[PDB]
Design a protein around this ligand. Structure first.
Ligand SMILES: Nc1ncnc2c1ncn2[C@@H]1O[C@H](COP(=O)(O)OP(=O)(O)O)[C@@H](O)[C@H]1O
Ligand SMILES: Nc1ncnc2c1ncn2[C@@H]1O[C@H](COP(=O)(O)OP(=O)(O)O)[C@@H](O)[C@H]1O
Ligand SMILES: COCCCCCNC(=O)CCNC(=O)[C@H](O)C(C)(C)COP(=O)(O)O
Ligand SMILES: COCCCCCNC(=O)CCNC(=O)[C@H](O)C(C)(C)COP(=O)(O)O
Ligand SMILES: [Mg+2]
Ligand SMILES: [Mg+2]
Lengths: 265, 259
């Protein structure tokens, strides 16, 4: 078989292609050892690698392998996944929301990195843990769905009281801006985790909508594993993308865009 | 008098005299204003109305964006800068980003990462409510065990962007579980992430509007050298030219008076 692997900061994504039956496999990066041992016992017609931990794999394998830059690979797998799923977009921003976040403009032909920020899945896990002691990703993201952000976040209408503001009053003005206004109140693990995802969702969208306006597209494709088991994040991202007059897109297996692309380059 | 009554701080300029007062003590500002009559009064900010209705004299009310820009242009001239164009980034309770073309300003975006987040998230990670103690507590914090750089993700590989870049704020926490995340380290990371998001937003609209100049203002920079260093280093790293300005947090109040 043919196998493509995007070995990221947190997750290793593997796709095997047989003929036209894909297999999508996720493993932890910390169990990268167990991906190598597994790889060495497969019969592999072609192997392709990308991501930060690609070299760790290449060196520990007894089989040659091509290595591609993850920006190029993500773009290539995303284009394939968008066609398959019936989106024919002339151009778009894509925002890869992984351990960290990378923002790309795809003009129709190629991708170009137009920015990035360290607000993404790693912040959700890291800051999440600092605010809740919860290490289990499932527990963390499940708990955050039940959360309320009202006592934590400060909207524009709170700063502008009775009077009429110069931007929409419902907008978030200050993430964690209301904490000092509602001391006494507990601040529950749910509420705080919702606010973390809230701030991460909002920064990514802001960057994406800004860059979208810069390169003159209304299409914003969001990918990365950060969106798995995290409805709040997609909602946050999606509502605000629409609110700013852009069109958000999520993609089935969009978090495997790198591993697929590695196979088709 | 010119006043910019923000979400957190009320900034007063008497014509120059520069006085700051907490927004939660707005009651005392009215009390103070009424007790001494004034030739002309101008107002701006979110809490301009709360003042206007609790006061005697017909003080004009301006949009804070237009005022901030008018005051900043004046502060820049007084402090020897002659910039043809620039972005300015008003880092207040939240953050508002503006492109000034040489003639007028335009709001080009904003984000809720700023001083309100430094205070709020800061409290949630340290229990510290005093602004001066918190920002001091952060100054010599160490981010190594909290933040994840590009070179950490790209251990065996050559990275496609500079390895010293921050990759994931707080993204090292799970890699340093049996360790004490001290209040200083954690407060340094809060300021770290706030400073980086504001810079990224700033440099992006700077590229968009074809200007290399980025003027940073707001009171988020008072008593926070780390925030300035963070904003400044990375602005320079992205080929843009950062500027701070004396009393730049009073830009709105000054601008209210000139308009
Ligand atoms: N099973 C899981 N374990 C840990 N994190 C997960 C899991 N599923 C989703 N995530 C989220 O996805 C993020 C990393 O996703 P990914 O897009 O694969 O980045 P990378 O390419 O760096 O591995 C994590 O930081 C976390 O927020
Ligand atoms: N003495 C202080 N007390 C509280 N916060 C302060 C103080 N000095 C500086 N700050 C910081 O500056 C922010 C206020 O910036 P500013 O431009 O005055 O915002 P606003 O216009 O919303 O009042 C606060 O959220 C806080 O981060
Ligand atoms: C001092 O550093 C200032 C940093 C300013 C913020 C800029 N940071 C960045 O653009 C890097 C953000 N992260 C990313 O682009 C990604 O995480 C990558 C480093 C490409 C790794 O990809 P993944 O492992 O898939 O997250
Ligand atoms: C629900 O919306 C989700 C996220 C929207 C984020 C965009 N938010 C913004 O552009 C507003 C951010 N805040 C600001 O621009 C400022 O804080 C202002 C509201 C202008 C007030 O100024 P000050 O009181 O001086 O901070
Ligand atoms: Mg990745
Ligand atoms: Mg202000």
């Amino acid at each position: 078989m043919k196998v493509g692997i995007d070995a990221g900061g947190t997750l290793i994504k593997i796709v095997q292609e047989q003929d036209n039956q894909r297999t999508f496999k996720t493993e932890l990066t910390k169990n990268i050892d167990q991906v190598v041992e597994w790889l060495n016992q497969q019969q592999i017609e072609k192997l392709c690698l990308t991501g930060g931990n690609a070299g760790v794999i290449a060196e520990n394998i007894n089989i040659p392998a091509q290595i591609f830059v993850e920006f190029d690979a993500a773009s290539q797998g995303l284009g394939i996944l968008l066609k398959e799923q019936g989106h024919d977009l002339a151009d778009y921003i894509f925002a890869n929301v992984g351990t960290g976040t990378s923002l790309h403009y795809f003009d129709g032909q190629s991708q170009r990195r137009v920015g990035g920020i360290g607000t993404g899945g790693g912040m959700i896990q890291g800051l999440g843990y600092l605010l809740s002691q919860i290490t289990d990703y499932k527990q963390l993201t499940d708990m955050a769905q039940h959360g309320d952000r009202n006592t934590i976040d400060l909207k524009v209408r709170h700063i502008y009281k009775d009077t009429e503001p110069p931007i929409p009053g419902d907008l978030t003005a200050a993430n964690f801006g209301h904490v000092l206004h509602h001391l006494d109140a507990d601040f529950t693990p749910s509420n705080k985790l919702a606010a973390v995802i809230g701030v991460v969702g909002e920064v990514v969208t802001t960057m994406a909508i800004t860059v979208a306006r810069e390169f003159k597209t209304e299409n914003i494709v969001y990918i990365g594993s950060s969106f798995h088991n995290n409805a709040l994040l997609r909602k946050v991202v999606e509502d605000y993308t629409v609110l700013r007059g852009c069109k958000p897109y999520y993609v089935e297996n969009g978090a495997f865009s790198g591993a697929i692309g590695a196979l088709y380059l």
